[PDB]
Amino acid sequence: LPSPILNPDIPYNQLFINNEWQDAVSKKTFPTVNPTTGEVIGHVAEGDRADVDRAVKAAREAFRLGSPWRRMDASERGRLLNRLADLVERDRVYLASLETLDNGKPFQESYALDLDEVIKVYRYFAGWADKWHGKTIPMDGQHFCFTRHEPVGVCGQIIPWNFPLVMQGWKLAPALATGNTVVMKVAEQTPLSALYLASLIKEAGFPPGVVNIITGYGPTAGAAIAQHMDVDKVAFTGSTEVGHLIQKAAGDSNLKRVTLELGGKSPSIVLADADMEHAVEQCHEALFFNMGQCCCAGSRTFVEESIYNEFLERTVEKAKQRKVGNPFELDTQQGPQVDKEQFERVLGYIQLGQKEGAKLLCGGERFGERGFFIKPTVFGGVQDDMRIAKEEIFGPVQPLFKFKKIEEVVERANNTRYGLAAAVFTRDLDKAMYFTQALQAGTVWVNTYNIVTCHTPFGGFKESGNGRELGEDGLKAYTEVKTVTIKVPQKNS
Amino acid sequence: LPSPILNPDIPYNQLFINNEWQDAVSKKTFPTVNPTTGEVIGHVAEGDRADVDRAVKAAREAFRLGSPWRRMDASERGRLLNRLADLVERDRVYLASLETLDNGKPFQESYALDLDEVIKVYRYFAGWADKWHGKTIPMDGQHFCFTRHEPVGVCGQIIPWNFPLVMQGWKLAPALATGNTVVMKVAEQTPLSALYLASLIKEAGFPPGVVNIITGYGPTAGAAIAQHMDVDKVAFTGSTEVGHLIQKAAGDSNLKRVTLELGGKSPSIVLADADMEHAVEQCHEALFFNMGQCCCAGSRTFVEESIYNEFLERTVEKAKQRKVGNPFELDTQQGPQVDKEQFERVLGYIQLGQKEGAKLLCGGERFGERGFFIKPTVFGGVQDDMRIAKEEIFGPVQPLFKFKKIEEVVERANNTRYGLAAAVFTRDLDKAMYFTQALQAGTVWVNTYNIVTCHTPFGGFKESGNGRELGEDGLKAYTEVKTVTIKVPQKNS
């Protein structure tokens, strides 16, 4: 429970390439907003294709066979990720404040949850660096066979705005541990935190060009990376629609390797025998956590028929109770949406729900006068055909669904292009074990929600993604396997 | 070595869909050519889009929750794969003959190598079915976390003509072991053997819809699969060219998962201290194996200056020695190319080589005047910038190169958009060890070539592929990871 720095010095507002700060070729900039006040915080360098080209050559050089970064011990790569984490913890109050400033999330979140997960991912993967093993293989014939786990190479990385430092860690930590080099494009919203961190990557002792950071727009800077002919791998976190473009740009350019971490319409499923007050609290937090701007948010609450009215009333009361206000004041649970578009976009979805036949139970309008705050909104009587039931709202709007049968709710939960996450609330063993098989999602929770750490693999089924991030499974994306098969004189077991 | 069946009965020439032989919806057929004579062996059904929809419907139903395929034991999936190995070994002669008839490969190859690799690959992945383990994870908090290794779902599988039975087995064996269903598109040049196999899949007792076979054209039948909106994964083996289209098609459809096994221009590299006779014999077979129609063929023989003349002379002699002729004769080493289009494409490359100032050393024209035979061809004094140095010939054309230093040959070997395979020939330990780190290839041989068994992962660096086939690493493509995270009352080590 420390004290936030209410308005700090922001020395870093340029591109980070080859371990030095410099402007865009064109010298352009663009504004970043504070969503609570609505006012422009400051200007940041606007990257484009020429700037990317620079970063890729820097990255490519740091990955040259013989390079400091390539020659170095895998354990030294770990120690660097560990130093980096020491530094993040030293500047924790600055970083958690700068995150709240630029993104709008509560400072209790930023500090306690976000920055903690940033420290642990760098520390977790640090440990993985010298533990990632290839195989020796007792193959047929007079042969000694083994696999090498080499890095994939220059890894392009594109992240969204909703967890700016977390999402950065999810990308950098594993790529660096497996020995790769990185050209990262951060969101156009929320660019400031990631630049301060880049300073600590330099201070930690990472060689020039191993990490390069680029502020700028998606259609320009981002698509330059996804289309570059000398980028070995792209890793994209963002919307399902842009995901489709990224995989096309890979196939259109150089057949670079692709991981996609995309959207969700993740169901929260509450059975009869569930702990009532525990389900209402978790399903509430499932949705409204990070103001609904969370990829796997519980944006479709399905509740068993016999407990629906009780569940409804409590869920609304929890939303009415939810403290909306300035995120720097500790005890604020809900900050503002991240920018003007998202604010208007969510408000449009609220209107749309009403127009289709859903009952607005509470909130459903702007909170206050300044900034991009919205009153916690809950809908009832919601049907599967409705647009709010099908589309990723990405804001503080909780639609409630009724169901009768177990076989019914699994069909309805899965009936979507999404498949990032899901959950069951139940006291029953057998029913818990059925839902873990039946639900088409990459992460299934039982009697909890939004539990994701550096150990837990995370990614989507179907149009929610390709591949997985975090855990041991998250290293595979940043690994290119070489098979080495050597003729030998005689072979013995 | 047994007698071949010269005039086998060919009962199977239709689509295989839901364990039923059926004509295409259009009733259209198309002919397959014996490349040894040039005559039409017979007609097979010309599948198109409407026929792929029907196949994918069947594969989807077979994959439903509660279907026989899904709730079967993993060890029964193994026994099915083993039973099929037995049936293949029962009909080994028939199948190796039908392969020769349709592909043109020597009957010695078809029986002793191809059909042995097919039996071994089905028996190998039979073993993996019930040994493919997920994780239990010591995760932060009051949680029990584990991973399930689920099948990825409906897998679209597209294969080339050069090793029909083997390419099918590399696809079906791991896919089935991990519990997927399959829609397979086999090459138009060689549709017959793959259909007789489907007859044994039925006889082995696989459920209906689990394996489906479509004969038909690439831009029609193959594109129908790759673009299909209910196919979960596409595994494509073919040209780099078509590879770009498959990865684009995925991004353009439903974000299906993509493994690509693509072309090569793999270098064999001979050092001064190598066993000459052996290095000559191996580099010779590296290229001329399967009439040069091999993805990872040693199609750039690099040789150290001090042994070059002696190497050249011996290589040329070997080329002139290689018995060309009818593949059904036991001592034939080189059959015809697969069809007229491939036959002419290679003679184009032979002409093109000499136009660029490459020295022709032997062969260089048709062999005889019936079927699609070409003379073992070898090219002296070849330079990096020539089209025959850069492009995949896919025929019995062995260009020789010359080098002085190691750092030189590593540069020159790696300077290509390909990276499927490579080899080095040397007696020295440090050198062998250096080349295994330096060469940018998914497979690196030492004092041998074309050693690929079920045990050994196989796939490309750069534009030669995305992901890996065979070995344990071969199972990852056919696996969708689900993370389960359960709230527990308390957590102890």
Ligand SMILES: NC(=O)c1ccc[n+]([C@@H]2O[C@H](COP(=O)([O-])OP(=O)(O)OC[C@H]3O[C@@H](n4cnc5c(N)ncnc54)[C@H](O)[C@@H]3O)[C@@H](O)[C@H]2O)c1
């Ligand atoms: N699964 C996960 O790990 C995860 C985590 C957080 C958010 N998300 C998802 O991300 C979305 C929210 O972020 P968003 O709206 O800013 O997504 P977005 O697709 O609009 O942009 C994300 C990033 O990609 C860039 N980009 C945009 N268009 C591009 C293009 N044509 N080519 C290359 N790059 C481009 C942006 O500049 C930004 O850096 C939601 O749909 C959410 O569910 C997923």
Ligand SMILES: NC(=O)c1ccc[n+]([C@@H]2O[C@H](COP(=O)([O-])OP(=O)(O)OC[C@H]3O[C@@H](n4cnc5c(N)ncnc54)[C@H](O)[C@@H]3O)[C@@H](O)[C@H]2O)c1
């Ligand atoms: N790396 C490996 O595992 C491996 C093994 C053997 C062969 N190969 C490669 O395969 C190639 C030779 O086979 P090929 O000549 O039939 O190549 P190809 O690209 O023309 O076609 C391969 C398969 O895809 C189909 N196809 C063609 N165009 C298509 C399209 N637009 N959409 C969907 N499917 C399409 C064909 O019908 C065929 O079944 C060579 O490049 C060789 O190196 C690779």
Ligand code: NA
């Ligand atoms: Na902002």
Ligand code: NA
């Ligand atoms: Na044929």
